[PDB]
Structure 1
Amino acid sequence: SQLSPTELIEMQNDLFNKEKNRQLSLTPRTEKIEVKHVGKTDPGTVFVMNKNISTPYSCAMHLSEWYCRKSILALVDGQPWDMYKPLTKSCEIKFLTFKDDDPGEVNKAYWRSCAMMMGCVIERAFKDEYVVSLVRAPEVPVIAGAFCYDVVLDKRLDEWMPTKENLHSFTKDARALIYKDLPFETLEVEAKVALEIFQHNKYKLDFIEEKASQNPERIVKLHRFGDFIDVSEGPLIPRTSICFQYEVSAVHNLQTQSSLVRRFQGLSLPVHLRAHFTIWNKLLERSRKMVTEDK
């Protein structure tokens, strides 16, 4: 198909908004749900929220600004939940921060979110004369050097390793994305509709089908911030501006008998947990090394 980069982004935004309106129209009347706060700090608090339009961030706004800024992931019952995905049914809520003794759930979400930011920067950095295909964001533990994102480039761009300036160019663009405040939007979209969003990308269609096989309902999760739409597993941090230190470490080559995937690795730290300059440089060097963990 003959679609310019501006048009294909506009088409996806139109499709995503159309799906969002359909979900809102499925609830004709505002329904009141009673949410009991089971957090350690303020037990016994009962919230009376609206169905499918009230997010846990709006739930946190009732308490104080401290819950608005410290909280990252909300715990609906026993399931992790984003702070911008609207609630569905009456349940119990708990807020998890970095300072908690078990930030493992929050650490995984932050690592996933930073990978998505790199994909947006990589996709909209190459010239339109080259084709960029985003494959996926492999799940690597935080104990590893850094988060990695897999990108397939053009065939005529096979013999090209980015230079130091080119690697730093991605970081500057990422920081510009950090400078503007863009919330993360989570939407549940049916599998066939998701295939329409990523029609151009062959690899994304395969990723959607694989994810849809794990759920009997053929339901997938889509996350959008700004004008970029991507499919990812698990929740994400509520706000883009949570990241403070961001850097693209280096690239690596993984050659398969069918295609070549470029592995972009970068290391980031949040505002709350920013480190010293001496410690940051030590951690940055370890991020240069190859990361190999898929299954």
Structure 2
Amino acid sequence: XXXXXXXXXXXXXXXXXXXXXXXXXXXXXXXXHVGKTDPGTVFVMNKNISTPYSCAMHLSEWYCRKSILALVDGQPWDMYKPLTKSCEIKFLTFKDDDPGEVNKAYWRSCAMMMGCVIERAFKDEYVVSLVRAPEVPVIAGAFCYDVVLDKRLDEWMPTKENLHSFTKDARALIYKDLPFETLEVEAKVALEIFQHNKYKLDFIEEKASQNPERIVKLHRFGDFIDVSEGPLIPRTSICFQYEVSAVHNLQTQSSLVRRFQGLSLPVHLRAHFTIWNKLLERSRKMVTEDKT
């Protein structure tokens, strides 16, 4: 499973390098960024596939480190979202009155993150087998990560120490400080990469083919790749803590589905350890609910 993951990561890196090469082949472009977040700001630079986060860096280190999301021409985008021609750049943060976008992005980042973690733990033991299902976001403050496993994992029970170890590895990758990557790829090469995952194949085939856009955004964290229609968390330093609350088993059309669920911590801030235990209980209860 290590050779297949290394070959898939090498094929994804070659496809990302080829797409990036063919898209950035012309390095002559005009990027004008003008808008008022704080009072007015006017800047003009020449680059292709320009990053608004680099403009945040251009302003100062403070607004840079406090940058979470980027509102462009009224449309909310990730800070890694490339800009072209004239654009109006606004900096959206958690403390702002509109938590929704950064919240959704946060939950989708947490789902992805564990998408990597579980896989890495499953790369520790060759006995286990993992197949990723689609993820279900919940605006109630929940996120559900769906997956299916080998029969051996169906026979063997998920002891508490296990999930604790998953949490430890999650925090490990959290303080490892690994930057997220944003790739623009065709549905074809993507289909080829996701061939080993049936649910993702069905996802792309059914949903993405109906969509007029053949350009899909692949978010890469470590050796893990995920499909996202929306913004991602800026860095690994943004997420202070993570926890694994509980799992569920659903039976549909004579098929079994294993759904893992947990919670996340915004703006690197926790009130106390008591309210943390309370957050554990709340987490598990929200897992028992399984909102849809």
TM-score after normalising by structure 2: 0.79
Query: Contact 1:222–1:231 at 8 Å: present in 2 too?
Result: yes
Contact 1:138 1:294 in 2 (8 A): no
Cα 1:269–1:171, aligned 2, differ >3 Å: closer, same or farther?
same
CA 1:131 to 1:82, structure 2 compared with 1: closer, same or farther past 3 Å? farther
TM-superposition CA deviations, 1:38-69 (whole Å, max 9, x none) = 76543321122344342111010122212111
- Identity across matched positions, percent: 100
User: How far did residue 267 of structure 1 move?
Assistant: 1.1
Q: Contact 1:208–1:220 (CA<8 Å) still a contact in 2? A: no
Check 1:61–1:290 CA distance in 2 against 1; reply closer, same or farther (3 A cut). Answer: closer
Q: 2:256 matched to 1:248?
A: no
Change (3 A) 1:176 1:83: same
Cα distance in 2 for residues equivalent to 1:244 and 1:205: 33
Q: Tell me: CA distance 1:292–1:80, structure 2 relative to 1, closer, same or farther (3 Å).
A: farther
Secondary structure of the structure 2 residue equivalent to 1:255 = strand
Aligned length: 259
Is the alpha carbon distance of 1:208 and 1:237 closer, same or farther for their aligned partners in structure 2, counting shifts above 3 Å? same
Q: Could you tell me whether the CA contact under 8 Å between 1:185 and 1:223 is conserved in 2?
A: yes
Distance across 2 between alignment mates of 1:54 and 1:159: 51
* Greater Cα offset, 218-227 or 132-141: 132-141
Distance 1:138-1:169 versus aligned 2 partners, 3 A rule: same
Q: Say if 1:47 and 1:126 are closer, same or farther in 2 by CA, change over 3 A.
A: same
Q: Tell me: CA distance 1:258–1:38, structure 2 relative to 1, closer, same or farther (3 Å).
A: farther
Q: In the aligned structure 2, how far is the partner of 1:191 from the partner of 1:269?
A: 33
Map 1:35-74 → 2, pairs under 5 A? 41-74=37-70
Question: Of Structure 1 and Structure 2, which has the larger fraction of its residues in helix?
Answer: 2
Shift of 1:214: 4.4
Alignment match, 1:269: 265
- From 99, 107, 110, the counterpart of 1:111: 107
Q: For the structure 1 residues 253 and 229, does the alpha-carbon distance in structure 2 shift closer, same or farther, using more than 3 Å as the test? A: same
SS at match of 1:242: coil
Change (3 A) 1:217 1:144: closer
Q: Which residue number corresponds to residue 196 of structure 1?
A: 192
User: Could you tell me how far 1:209 is from its partner in structure 2?
Assistant: 1.7
Tell me the residue number matched to 1:28: none
Q: Who is 2:180 aligned against?
A: 184
Contact 1:147 1:265 in 2 (8 A): yes
What secondary structure does 2:195 align onto? coil
Sort the Cα spacing of 1:67 and 1:133 in 2 relative to 1 into closer, same or farther, 3 A.
farther
1: distance between equivalents of 2:128 and 2:182?
Answer: 24
Distance 1:152 1:139, change over 3 A: closer
CA contact 2:142–2:286 (8 Å) conserved in 1: no
- Output the CA distance in 2 between the equivalents of 1:220 and 1:133: 27
Shift of the 59–134 alpha-carbon distance from structure 1 to 2, 3 Å rule, reads: farther
In structure 2, what is the Cα distance between the partners aligned to 1:171 and 1:129? 17
Structure 2 residue ranges without an equivalent (≥5): 1-32
Cα offset, 1:83, TM superposition: 1.3
Whole-Å separation in 2 of the counterparts to 1:159 and 1:290: 26
- Tell me the distance in 2 between the aligned counterparts of 1:91 and 1:259: 48
Contact 1:187 1:222 in 2 (8 A): yes
- Say if 2:180 and 2:235, in contact at 8 Å, map to a contact too: yes
Say which is worse superposed, 188-197 or 165-174, in terms of deviation: 188-197
Give 3-state SS (helix, strand or coil) of 2:98's partner. coil
Tell me the residue number matched to 1:284.
Answer: 280
Q: 1:133 to 1:44 in 2, by over 3 A?
A: farther
Quick one: structure 1 residues 211 and 80, their matched pair in 2 at CA, closer, same or farther if it must change by over 3 Å? farther
Counterpart contact for 1:73–1:97, Cα < 8 Å: yes
Q: Which sections of structure 1, spanning at least 5 residues, go unmatched?
A: 1-36
Please report the TM-score for the alignment, with normalisation by the length of structure 1.
0.78
Asked whether the 8 Å contact 2:187–2:215 carries over to 1, the reply is: yes
**Closer/same/farther in 2, CA of residues 192 and 45 from structure 1, 3 Å limit:** same
C-alpha separation in 1, matches of 2:271 and 2:51: 31
Q: How much has 1:280 moved relative to structure 2?
A: 1.6
